Scaffold this active site. Structure first.
Site, PDB file in Angstrom:
ATOM      1  N   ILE A  22      12.907  84.744  53.401  1.00  0.00           N
ATOM      2  CA  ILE A  22      12.482  85.404  54.631  1.00  0.00           C
ATOM      3  C   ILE A  22      12.997  86.837  54.693  1.00  0.00           C
ATOM      4  O   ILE A  22      12.214  87.784  54.787  1.00  0.00           O
ATOM      5  CB  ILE A  22      12.915  84.602  55.877  1.00  0.00           C
ATOM      6  N   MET A  29      21.631  85.616  53.040  1.00  0.00           N
ATOM      7  CA  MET A  29      20.204  85.437  52.835  1.00  0.00           C
ATOM      8  C   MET A  29      19.646  84.480  53.888  1.00  0.00           C
ATOM      9  O   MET A  29      20.379  83.712  54.511  1.00  0.00           O
ATOM     10  CB  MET A  29      19.967  84.890  51.430  1.00  0.00           C
ATOM     11  N   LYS A  45      20.081  79.749  57.497  1.00  0.00           N
ATOM     12  CA  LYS A  45      20.924  80.926  57.354  1.00  0.00           C
ATOM     13  C   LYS A  45      22.025  80.584  56.356  1.00  0.00           C
ATOM     14  O   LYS A  45      22.871  79.726  56.630  1.00  0.00           O
ATOM     15  CB  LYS A  45      21.512  81.334  58.709  1.00  0.00           C
ATOM     16  N   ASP A 140      25.694  91.757  72.194  1.00  0.00           N
ATOM     17  CA  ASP A 140      24.892  92.409  71.165  1.00  0.00           C
ATOM     18  C   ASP A 140      23.405  92.159  71.409  1.00  0.00           C
ATOM     19  O   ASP A 140      22.624  91.934  70.471  1.00  0.00           O
ATOM     20  CB  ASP A 140      25.310  91.950  69.769  1.00  0.00           C
TER      21      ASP A 140
HETATM   22  N1  LIG Z   1      15.214  81.281  63.195  1.00  0.00           N
HETATM   23  C1  LIG Z   1      14.686  82.494  62.604  1.00  0.00           C
HETATM   24  N2  LIG Z   1      13.380  82.607  62.391  1.00  0.00           N
HETATM   25  C2  LIG Z   1      12.883  83.721  61.856  1.00  0.00           C
HETATM   26  N3  LIG Z   1      13.669  84.732  61.512  1.00  0.00           N
HETATM   27  C3  LIG Z   1      15.021  84.720  61.695  1.00  0.00           C
HETATM   28  C4  LIG Z   1      15.560  83.574  62.249  1.00  0.00           C
HETATM   29  C5  LIG Z   1      16.962  83.812  62.323  1.00  0.00           C
HETATM   30  I1  LIG Z   1      18.488  82.547  63.053  1.00  0.00           I
HETATM   31  C6  LIG Z   1      17.215  85.078  61.823  1.00  0.00           C
HETATM   32  N4  LIG Z   1      16.066  85.615  61.434  1.00  0.00           N
HETATM   33  C7  LIG Z   1      16.042  86.956  60.863  1.00  0.00           C
HETATM   34  O1  LIG Z   1      15.199  87.934  61.867  1.00  0.00           O
HETATM   35  C8  LIG Z   1      14.128  88.276  61.249  1.00  0.00           C
HETATM   36  C9  LIG Z   1      12.906  87.544  61.915  1.00  0.00           C
HETATM   37  O2  LIG Z   1      11.867  88.470  62.055  1.00  0.00           O
HETATM   38  C10 LIG Z   1      14.298  87.885  59.751  1.00  0.00           C
HETATM   39  O3  LIG Z   1      14.421  89.021  58.999  1.00  0.00           O
HETATM   40  C11 LIG Z   1      15.543  87.044  59.660  1.00  0.00           C
HETATM   41  O4  LIG Z   1      16.599  87.757  58.825  1.00  0.00           O
END
Ligand SMILES: Nc1ncnc2c1c(I)cn2[C@@H]1O[C@H](CO)[C@@H](O)[C@H]1O
Ligand SMILES: COc1cc2nc(NC(=O)c3csc(COc4ccc(F)cc4)n3)sc2cc1OC
Length: 351
Positions: A22, A29, A45, A140
C-alpha cells in the site's frame, strides 16, 4: 509464518495472505491482506520501533489507546501479531480495517462540495467528542490521519502523539516534545509549549476545515516562526490580551517586532464557502485558546444542525489512564510493556 512482498518480509499468515503493498507509515511498511478468518481484506501495519525510545513510546501509546477506544469514527485494532519470545520480537504487525483512502490523498484529487465537507467535519467532531470525553488529546489531527471509505465513513487514526489531558501539566520544554505536525499546530503550543489542553485539537480541526474549503493548507509555514507568520497574516496582529497568555517572555519578541497586520475577512479568503462554515471556522481558529470553541459547542453550531444528535454521539465510559507515565522509560522497558499489551492476542493469554 511465510510471506514477503517488495523485498521486505511480512511474518503475517497463515491467516493473512494475498498481500499487496500500500504505502509507507512512520516506522513501517503497510500492505493490505485477505483475512482468512473474517473473509475480507484488511490493512496490516508492519512496525519496527524498538531501536529508538521515542518510536516505542508512540507505538505503545497507540496500542493502549486504540485497544480501549470503541467508536465508529476511530480506527480499531483487530489483531496484533508479534513473536512469541520478547527477545525474538523485532517487528509488530497491527491489523486494522482496510480503508479506501484518507483526506490527504482525497484533497489531492477532488474539490469537496459544501455538503460533503459538512458531513466530514461532523464525523471528525463526533470522533473528537468521544476522544475528549475520555480525557484524551489526539495532538496530531491532520488530513492524512483521517481515513476514508465513503463520504459517510471517516475514521481518526494514528494516536502516537496522544496524551491524557492535563490542563495543568506544564513543562515549557520547547525542545522536549513533538506536538502536532507544524501546519496544524495551535499557537499556544508554539508560544507557551502548552500542549496538554483540548483547545489544541480544536485548532487542528479548524486547519482541516480551512483545508477542505480550498484544497490547500491554510497555514503552510516552513518552520515554527514562519508558521506564526502565516497565522498572524490571516488572523491579524494579536491583541494585548492575547499577548497576555504568552508565558514565554522571550516568545513575545518576534511578535512585538511585527508589522501590525489586519485580519483578513474569512469570506475574502474563502469567497465560495458557506457563511455558516466560515462562522464555525472563525470559532475554531481563535488565537487565544481560552476563547476557542469546544468540541460539543462545535457540534452544536448551526453549520452541523442537520446532523447534530447528542443521543447518537457516544462518549467514553471512563476517563482513560496511563497506569504509568512513559515519558522517560528506557526503550527496553517500553519494549517490555509493548510485549505485554500485545499479550491478549497470543495463545494462552490468561486473565
Ligand atoms: N487502515 C488503512 N487503510 C488504508 N490506508 C492506511 C491505513 C492505515 I492504519 C494507514 N494507512 C496509510 O494512509 C494512506 C491511506 O491513503 C496509506 O499510504 C497508508 O500508509
Ligand atoms: C471522494 O470522491 C468524491 C469527490 C467529490 N467532490 C465533489 N465536489 C463538488 O461536487 C462541488 C460542487 S460545488 C463545489 C465547490 O465547493 C466549495 C465550497 C466552499 C469553498 F470555499 C470552495 C469550494 N464542489 S462531489 C464528490 C463526490 C465524490 O465521491 C461520490
Amino acid at each position: 509464518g511465510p510471506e514477503m512482498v517488495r523485498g521486505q518480509v511480512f511474518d503475517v499468515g497463515p491467516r493473512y495472505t494475498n498481500l499487496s503493498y500500500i504505502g509507507e507509515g512512520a516506522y513501517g511498511m503497510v500492505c493490505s491482506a485477505y483475512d482468512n478468518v473474517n473473509k475480507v481484506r484488511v490493512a496490516i501495519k508492519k512496525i519496527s520501533p524498538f531501536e529508538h525510545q521515542t518510536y516505542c513510546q508512540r507505538t505503545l501509546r497507540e496500542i493502549k489507546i486504540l485497544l480501549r477506544f470503541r467508536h465508529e469514527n476511530i480506527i480499531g485494532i483487530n489483531d496484533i501479531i508479534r513473536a512469541p519470545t520478547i527477545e525474538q520480537m523485532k517487528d509488530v504487525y497491527i491489523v486494522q480495517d482496510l480503508m479506501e483512502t484518507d483526506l490527504y490523498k482525497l484533497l489531492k484529487t477532488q474539490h469537496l462540495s459544501n455538503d460533503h465537507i459538512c458531513y466530514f467535519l461532523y464525523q471528525i467532531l463526533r470522533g473528537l467528542k468521544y476522544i475528549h470525553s475520555a480525557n484524551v488529546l489526539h495532538r496530531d489531527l491532520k488530513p492524512s490521519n483521517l481515513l476514508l471509505n465513503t463520504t459517510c465513513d471517516l475514521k481518526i487514526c494514528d494516536f502516537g502523539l496522544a496524551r491524557v489531558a492535563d490542563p495543568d501539566h506544564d513543562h515549557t520544554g520547547f525542545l522536549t516534545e513533538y506536538v502536532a505536525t507544524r501546519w496544524y499546530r495551535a499557537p499556544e503550543i508554539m508560544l507557551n509549549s502548552k500542549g496538554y489542553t483540548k483547545s489544541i485539537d480544536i485548532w487542528s480541526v479548524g486547519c482541516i476545515l480551512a483545508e477542505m474549503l480550498s484544497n490547500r493548507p491554510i497555514f503552510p509555514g516552513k518552520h515554527y516562526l514562519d508558521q506564526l507568520n502565516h497565522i498572524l497574516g490571516i488572523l491579524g496582529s494579536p491583541s494585548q490580551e492575547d499577548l497576555n497568555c504568552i508565558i514565554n517572555l522571550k516568545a513575545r519578541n518576534y511578535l512585538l517586532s511585527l508589522p501590525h497586520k489586519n485580519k483578513v475577512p474569512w469570506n475574502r479568503l474563502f469567497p465560495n464557502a458557506d457563511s455558516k462554515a466560515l462562522d464555525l471556522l472563525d470559532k475554531m481558529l481563535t488565537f487565544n485558546p481560552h476563547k476557542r470553541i469546544e468540541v460539543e459547542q462545535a457540534l452544536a453550531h448551526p453549520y452541523l444542525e442537520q446532523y447534530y444528535d447528542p443521543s447518537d454521539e457516544p462518549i467514553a465510559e471512563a476517563p482513560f489512564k496511563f497506569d504509568m507515565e512513559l515519558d522517560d522509560l528506557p526503550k527496553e522497558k517500553l519494549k517490555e510493556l509493548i510485549f505485554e499489551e500485545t499479550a491478549r492476542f497470543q495463545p494462552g493469554y490468561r486473565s
